[PDB]
Amino acid sequence: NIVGCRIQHGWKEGNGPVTQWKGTVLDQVPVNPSLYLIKYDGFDCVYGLELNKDERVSALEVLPDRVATSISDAHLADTMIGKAVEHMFETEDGSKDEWRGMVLARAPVMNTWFYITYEKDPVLYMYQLLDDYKEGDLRIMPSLVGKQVEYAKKRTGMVIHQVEAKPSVYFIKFDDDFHIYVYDLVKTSAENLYFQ
Numbered sequence: 001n002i003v004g005c006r007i008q009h010g011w012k013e014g015n016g017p018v019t020q021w022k023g024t025v026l027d028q029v030p031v032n033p034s035l036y037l038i039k040y041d042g043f044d045c046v047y048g049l050e051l052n053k054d055e056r057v058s059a060l061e062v063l064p065d066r067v068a069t070s071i072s073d074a075h076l077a078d079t080m081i082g083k084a085v086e087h088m089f090e091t092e093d094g095s096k097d098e099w100r101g102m103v104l105a106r107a108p109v110m111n112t113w114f115y116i117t118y119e120k121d122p123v124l125y126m127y128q129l130l131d132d133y134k135e136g137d138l139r140i141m142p143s144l145v146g147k148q149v150e151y152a153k154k155r156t157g158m159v160i161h162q163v164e165a166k167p168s169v170y171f172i173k174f175d176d177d178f179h180i181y182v183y184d185l186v187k188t189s190a191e192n193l194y195f196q
């Protein structure tokens, strides 16, 4: 399949202009093989697209350049998984800000990258956390998969993955959006989610 490949495609919403995108295919979701998780070059979120049916996608092409294959410190990486973190980053004005979040897993395909999410935006992100850590920007603090989900806004989706390191945490793909939403099912954020 196209997992592990780099791809490029056009994107058009409605009568808007076509924009061009390059990225890396990370995963073909077991519970919905039409759904691919993609990391676009320079964009930090993980996106899910049903490439075989999404008419917003045009001119889909496999790129001839290979994904970097190739971690510098697998043991350090291992220890980050499941940890609460404070993640500092540089802002438009040159000052730094920080978001607190949780390291979820090593990313597939892109070896040096990690899945992470944040209280301020609880969707799936990917960063090279060992690079950010070495530069002093990362402080480490001391089955439902395949089921349908709804919440009242009726927003509908599917549970696509369970986080091994924190089994009450799941990834959800909603039908109306291309982000991957992350929820800890014991928390308030998840209290309007119901499953079938």
Ligand SMILES: COc1cc2c(NC3CCN(C(C)C)CC3)nc(NCCN(C)C)nc2cc1OCCCN1Cc2ccccc2C1
Pocket: 044, 087, 088, 089, 090, 099, 118, 125, 127, 131, 132, 135, 137
């Ligand atoms: C924008 O957030 C981050 C950018 C990062 C980021 N940018 C770079 C921007 C400038 N460079 C140059 C080459 C042109 C290219 C890449 N580089 C890195 N780590 C490599 C550098 N290191 C090791 C010194 N890490 C980053 C971590 C970020 O945020 C973590 C918390 C989650 N965010 C999501 C978010 C969304 C909207 C508002 C705010 C946030 C906060």
Ligand SMILES: [Cl-]
Pocket: 088, 089, 090
């Ligand atoms: Cl930064």
Ligand code: NA
Pocket: 135, 136, 137
């Ligand atoms: Na620094």
Ligand code: NA
Pocket: 176, 177, 178
């Ligand atoms: Na959408």
